[PDB]
Amino acid sequence: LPTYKLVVVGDGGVGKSALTIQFFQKIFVPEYDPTIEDSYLKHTEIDNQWAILDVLDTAGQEEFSAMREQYMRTGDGFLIVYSVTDKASFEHVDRFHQLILRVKDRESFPMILVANKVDLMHLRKVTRDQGKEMATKYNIPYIETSAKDPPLNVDKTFHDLVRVIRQQ
Numbered sequence: 551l552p553t554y555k556l557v558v559v560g561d562g563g564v565g566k567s568a569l570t571i572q573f574f575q576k577i578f579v580p581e582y583d584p585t586i587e588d589s590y591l592k593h594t595e596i597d598n599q600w601a602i603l604d605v606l607d608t609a610g611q612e613e614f615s616a617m618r619e620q621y622m623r624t625g626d627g628f629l630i631v632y633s634v635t636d637k638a639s640f641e642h643v644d645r646f647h648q649l650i651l652r653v654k655d656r657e658s659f660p661m662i663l664v665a666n667k668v669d670l671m672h673l674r675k676v677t678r679d680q681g682k683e684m685a686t687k688y689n690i691p692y693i694e695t696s697a698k699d700p701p702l703n704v705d706k707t708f709h710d711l712v713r714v715i716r717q718q
């Protein structure tokens with residue numbers, strides 16, 4: 551029974567917590583309450599293989615911290631989340647990508663690029679093409695999500711990260 555530490559990272563307000571709570575509790579949280587650090591555990595069967603998921607929902611910090619060093623070191627896989635309505639959050643994907651690899655001292659590491667809030671079509675500023683161009687640059691999977699009901703790709707996103715970790 552393996553444990554996967556899945557770490558959800560990204561700029562403030564991109565929907566890290568909403569995605570995590572949608573995954574665990576199947577509810578959309580409309581409030582924006584900034585996270586310090588929250589941990590969610592589940593014993594679950596994915597692709598006929600039981601696992602413990604230890605999901606770490608992180609703070610929306612841009613600057614580096616000891617907290618971030620700790621979770622970048624221990625994480626077994628990362629969701630790098632941006633909001634399609636927030637261009638800066640997308641630009642900053644490179645910073646997260648760079649730091650994870652530097653902390654791990656590796657050329658690659660399990661991660662998925664998550665383009666969140668795609669339900670907000672009238673506010674969307676980062677296109678699917680832009681997202682795919684970024685994911686292709688890093689040779690990592692790209693997925694579009696929405697935490698709002700009805701949710702889009704939320705289970706798939708977390709399960710796909712587990713699949714990437716297992717398919718190493």
Ligand SMILES: Nc1nc2c(ncn2[C@@H]2O[C@H](COP(=O)(O)OP(=O)(O)NP(=O)(O)O)[C@@H](O)[C@H]2O)c(=O)[nH]1
Nearest residue numbers: 562563564565566567568580584585610667696697
């Ligand atoms: N329409 C829509 N709103 C979303 C979506 N995901 C999150 N939100 C909203 O965006 C706001 C910020 O979400 P939140 O989950 O707190 O983001 P966060 O990345 O965890 N923030 P922090 O970095 O401060 O902890 C909330 O008002 C939340 O309801 C989404 O997919 N669609």
Ligand SMILES: [Mg+2]
Nearest residue numbers: 566567584585
């Ligand atoms: Mg949060």
